[PDB]
């Protein structure tokens, strides 16, 4: 039957309307493998035919328009709208010639001209159905449709509608004035944000809105419109004010490269004149504090002070102020309707005088547009942190980066399954060897890349569904935190969330938190106390229960955790010891809190002998029946755990110069750590001989390591001390001359596990007591 008969059928209109909702919902949110599958059922010509057959009914016209964008113009729509908020400009000479006003104080046309901000191409693929099936497939692009043909058709259907609407016909297209424009604006609005219109096309679009203003018929804004058609007018007008703003930023980027090229030769000529000036010495260094004594960030702050002590001449200090007056007048400040902001501020207020608007969506989109024009200065300001400037030789890799960025943001909105995981890992593995991620760490922070990889770790943790994903994400953040210090500053701020999910092999979310506080006195001083008590409460659990995965592996049972609890102390030994020095304010509060739950210590000293605890470890490590039976041996983790409980408290020992002063608080702590541990327990540990490799190699992860001895020597050399000559020579012959000639024997695997142990633990302590 003819489809126009649905206009009076009134039942199969509805069931074929709700089928179009199922078609838009199936290919929703970039599902592009199924987006080819719909392109069979609704062909390309019959969709383009249905855009202008005016005798179609009401809800079927808004279906076939919205079906079109949901199979062709959506997967490209979200990815470009994402990259609109950030502005990445290269230094081509085409960029270099960009002004605020067009040359000819007449305000230029919005959206018309040349922009240079980087955006990825769209990568459509044409549909087919006779191609053979392979096989995991990499991806499917969005299915294609000829765009240069489409823009002429879409402009025509708008162009008649503003003209036919003036005729005030009793039979509008599609049964109302609402359905005549809502499915033609939201296509034109989404072909305008994709940038596929020519400038002469949007010159015509500017005529079709209000031709009395934008000229280089009745205007569209004067036409009486129902409420929902005003809404797409706001989403059309919101594109235009951004093209004023993105042009303004690209004007200011063009100004600076003309300015700082003029500024470097001014400094280097002034410095050469400073290099030949010998007429002063006490005033010469006041001219030399800026040249090589100050950082280059502080130079530009000092150089740019001449508003209302500047080394710059009056010639190149005035044109900046001449430029600065060119920009405020370009904005809404008069700085003592032929303007766009004059048009909008008239139009939006008059819409409030028309009626009492009830739809809460429109009243938000009105006032957000109106505030954007009046504080046009602040609208420029809030975008400027997302402004960055790169080299023109780096563009050929930068747009290759941004496409590999966009796949992640497309995976922000889809619930993660086992395929796109392999898309995410292959994405991330292609970011970290792209060479620009390193050399501009401000830009990677500016694009919110460090934010984006966090939320895909949020959604997976909510039992772990996809562990191979969550390692490579937290591996990326750990490799991100050491690129610049301020990037570590940013990653530090999500600590309490990162701390809430401390709960396996490979990396972890907690090692992200560890690499967020390492090597930095600023963060370690600013670390909270409430962020510390959460760390010990997870340490409060491990001493009481076992690893359930280990007894699932068939291991012997041990009531505490020699493997799990060691995943906190390696964090906390970065929490109090930095740059080879101990902090004070954290050390005086970790140990006050560590003694509120004495179960947090290892229960052999909560108690058996400390050398006896390691002696209890050697039997259960050498005997395979008492050992864990594959990568986890219980005997290797108990000595490693007590290697962690020792050297933590060694790195919370108050420093020697505070012991020379009578700081009673600082010596109260040095009482407590010395009170806990007997000294002679260490001496049997410091002197126990090892299975040296010779002709055969013993196993590292089941036997004694020199790193077990390396923790203990740091404890006595920091809280107990070597005072007299006899006690120096007491442990001297018993411990180390066995090991030294064992090391001098092999002049090999554990030879290099012990060579670095001697040169980093004991040979300092000998030279501490050489006189």
């Amino acid at each position: 039957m003819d489809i126009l008969e649905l206009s009076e059928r009134l039942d199969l209109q509805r069931f074929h309307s709700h089928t179009l909702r199922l078609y838009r919902a199936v290919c929703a949110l970039g599902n592009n493998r199924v987006a080819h599958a719909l392109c069979s059922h609704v062909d390309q010509a019959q969709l383009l035919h249905a855009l202008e057959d005016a005798h179609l009914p009401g809800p079927l016209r808004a279906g076939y328009y919205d079906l079109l964008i949901s199979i062709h113009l959506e997967s490209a729509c979200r990815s470009r709208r994402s990259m609109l908020s950030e502005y990445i400009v290269p230094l081509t000479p085409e960029t270099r010639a960009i002004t605020l006003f067009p040359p000819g104080r007449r305000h230029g046309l919005p959206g018309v001209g040349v922009t240079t901000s980087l955006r990825p191409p769209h990568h459509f693929s044409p549909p087919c159905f006779v191609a053979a099936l392979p096989a995991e497939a990499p991806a499917r692009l969005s299915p294609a449709i000829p765009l240069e043909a489409l823009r002429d058709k879409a402009l025509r259907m708008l162009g008649e509608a503003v003209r036919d609407g003036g005729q005030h016909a009793r039979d509008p297209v599609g049964g109302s004035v609402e359905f005549q424009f809502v499915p033609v604006l939201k296509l034109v609005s989404t072909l305008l944000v994709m940038g596929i219109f020519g400038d002469e096309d949007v010159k015509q679009i500017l005529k079709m809105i209000e031709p009395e203003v934008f000229t280089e018929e009745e205007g569209l804004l004067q036409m009486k419109l129902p409420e929902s058609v005003k809404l797409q007018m706001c989403n059309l007008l919101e594109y235009f004010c951004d093209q004023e703003l993105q042009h303004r930023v690209e004007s200011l980027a063009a100004f600076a490269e003309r300015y700082v090229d003029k500024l470097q030769a001014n400094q280097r000529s002034r410095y050469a004149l400073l290099m030949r000036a010998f007429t002063m010495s006490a005033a010469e260094t006041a001219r030399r504090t800026r040249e090589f004594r100050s950082p280059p960030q502080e130079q530009i702050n000092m150089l740019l002070h001449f508003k209302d002590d500047c080394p710059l001449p009056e010639d190149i200090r005035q044109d900046l102020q001449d430029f600065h007056q060119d920009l405020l007048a370009h904005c809404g400040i008069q700085l003592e309707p032929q303007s766009l902001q004059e048009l909008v501020s008239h139009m939006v207020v008059r819409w409030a005088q028309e009626d009492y608007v009830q739809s809460p969506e429109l009243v938000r989109a009105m006032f957000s547009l109106l505030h954007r024009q009046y504080d046009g200065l602040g609208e420029l300001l809030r975008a400027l942190p997302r402004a960055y400037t790169i080299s023109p030789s780096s563009v050929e890799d930068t747009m290759s980066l941004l496409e590999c960025l966009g796949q992640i943001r497309s995976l922000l909105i889809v619930q993660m399954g086992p395929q796109e995981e392999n898309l995410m890992i292959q994405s991330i593995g292609n970011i970290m060897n792209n060479k620009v991620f390193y050399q501009h760490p401000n830009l990677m922070r500016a694009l919110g890349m460090h934010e984006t990889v966090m939320e895909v770790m949020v959604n997976v943790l909510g039992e772990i569904r996809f562990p191979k994903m969550v390692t490579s994400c937290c591996r990326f953040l750990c490799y991100f935190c050491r690129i610049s210090r301020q990037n570590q500053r940013s990653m530090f701020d999500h600590l309490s969330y990162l701390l809430e999910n401390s709960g396996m092999q490979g990396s972890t979310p907690l090692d992200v938190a560890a690499a967020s506080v390492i090597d930095n006195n600023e963060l370690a001083l600013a670390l909270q106390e409430q962020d510390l008590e959460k760390v010990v409460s997870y340490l409060a659990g491990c001493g009481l229960q076992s690893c359930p995965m280990l007894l699932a592996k068939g291991y012997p049972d041990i009531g505490w955790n020699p493997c799990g609890g060691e995943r906190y102390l390696d964090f906390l030994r970065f929490a109090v010891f930095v740059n080879g020095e101990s902090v004070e304010e954290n050390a005086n509060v970790v140990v006050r809190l560590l003694i509120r739950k004495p179960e947090c210590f290892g229960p052999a000293l909560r108690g058996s002998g400390l050398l006896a605890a390691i002696e209890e470890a050697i039997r259960i490590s050498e005997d395979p029946a008492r050992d864990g039976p594959n990568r986890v041996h219980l005997g290797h983790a108990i000595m490693s755990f007590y290697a962690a409980l020792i050297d933590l408290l060694g790195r919370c020992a108050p420093e020697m110069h505070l012991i020379q002063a009578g700081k009673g608080e600082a010596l109260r702590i040095r009482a407590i750590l010395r009170s806990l541990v007997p000294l002679d327990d260490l001496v049997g540990i410091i002197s126990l001989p090892l299975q040296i490799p010779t002709l055969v190699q013993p196993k590292m992860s089941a036997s004694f390591v020199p790193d077990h001895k390396a923790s203990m020597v740091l404890f006595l050399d920091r809280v107990y001390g070597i005072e007299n000559q006899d006690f120096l020579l007491h442990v001297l012959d018993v411990g180390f001359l066995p090991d030294m000639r064992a090391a001098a024997s092999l002049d090999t695997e554990m030879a290099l596990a012990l060579n670095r142990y001697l040169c980093l633990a004991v040979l300092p302590l000998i030279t501490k007591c050489a006189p």
Binding site: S281, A282, T285, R293, P295, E298, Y438, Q439, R482, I483
Partner: protein, 139 residues
Amino acid sequence: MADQLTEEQIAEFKEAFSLFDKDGDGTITTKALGTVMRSLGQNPTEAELQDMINEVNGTIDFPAFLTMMARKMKDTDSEEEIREAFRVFDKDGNGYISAAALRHVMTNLGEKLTDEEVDEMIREAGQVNYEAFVQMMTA
């Protein structure tokens, strides 16, 4: 902090790394790490090779490669920076900087040091040499 290297080294590093990249993945063998540094003129023996891999499976990835490249050039510049740091004090460049010419070059550098600390810098150290000055600054 990987920022202590300039751009063109990373440009030279990635050019070197992609030249010996196995399949374009950014993986290389343990042997090729030695060859690629000798392709960059750097000749460390297997002692400096052995401790670097165990610091970080035979698969060397480009960030894992680059973090080792930061540390090998961080220590060398950390000692040669301080003699050229003393070069601006003495008018000749040998080490003979007069103490009279110091109490205006030190209050005029940009760490906002007042007269009391540059005093405190001096009486807890005639012209002083350079090697006592690199001792009294590093402390």
